[PDB]
Ligand binder design. Structure first.
Ligand code: CL
Ligand code: CL
Ligand code: CL
Lengths: 119, 120, 119
């Protein structure tokens, strides 16, 4: 059964503006340790962050819990996946979450994501 | 089992332009009585209407099109967006055996989007 | 259970730009025979292709292949459905896909689509 559903859309220019004003602050707040390491060497880190933000916001909505607790990674097939930390992980176990489905897309100006959590 | 799936994207400026040209007409057709009352006094009414359009269009698609005013959006006691169905849409959900409706929406400066899944 | 989830957003002006470069060659690539026939006489071929593109990319993400293997058609009622060919059809049979849920939307500047495949 579906236990939760979330979506988000992110204007990439909005994230760019935050970075211009705050520097690394946003990424340090919302990225897990593994994601931070990617951020540091990424060729397009603003785009990377905006896409991560979209997924994390979609995940947070699906679960109804800081953004750095919703880690996005790509599995052995190259498919985007969620790995939970801390309170988010405890909530997942509490809710009886068995599967988590993640998708994201980006165009030049916008990134989008949808997350479904399932028993 | 999933019984239906719908999505929509709404350019807020389009809603703004229609309201500028014909005022209340757009809102009157698609809003329930409760939603109309909110529309009339909302601090950001164009954004309110745009976001309502995204959810209603997504819902209508999920139900496999139904009048938008029969897909009432409300926030529950925890503040989460939910559907309240009326008339033909309510009877349809009963006939389809809908047990669960899942609604999500998002908005940026220029666009709102929404996805609805209905489930047995 | 949900077997896969995909989403896409397509900037229509980008598709228009691709068509300016290579004419009908993109359509030749991503469209099945049935879609190609519709393309030839469409009133708005750019929009048609952009919308097809969004659905096809979302479907490919849901399955985790080629775009011409994910045919979009309208059923007797008028709602979008997927018809699979070649490798896509074989993969669906392997995964035991029972239902394929498709939705799409378009604004002036963007098309979007979400696909859910189910057991
Ligand atoms: Cl407004
Ligand atoms: Cl209507
Ligand atoms: Cl066109």
């Amino acid at each position: 059964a579906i236990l939760g559903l979330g979506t988000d859309i992110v204007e990439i220019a909005r994230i760019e503006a935050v970075i211009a004003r705050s520097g690394d602050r946003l990424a340090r707040r919302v990225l897990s340790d593994n994601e931070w390491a990617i951020w540091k060497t990424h060729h397009q880190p603003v785009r990377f962050l905006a896409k991560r933000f979209a997924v994390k916001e979609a995940a947070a909505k699906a679960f109804g819990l800081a953004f750095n607790q919703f880690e996005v990674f790509n599995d052995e097939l190259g498919k985007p996946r969620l790995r939970l930390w801390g309170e988010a992980l405890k909530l997942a176990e509490k809710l009886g979450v068995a599967n988590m489905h993640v998708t994201l897309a980006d165009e030049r100006h916008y990134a989008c994501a949808t997350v479904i959590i399932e028993s």
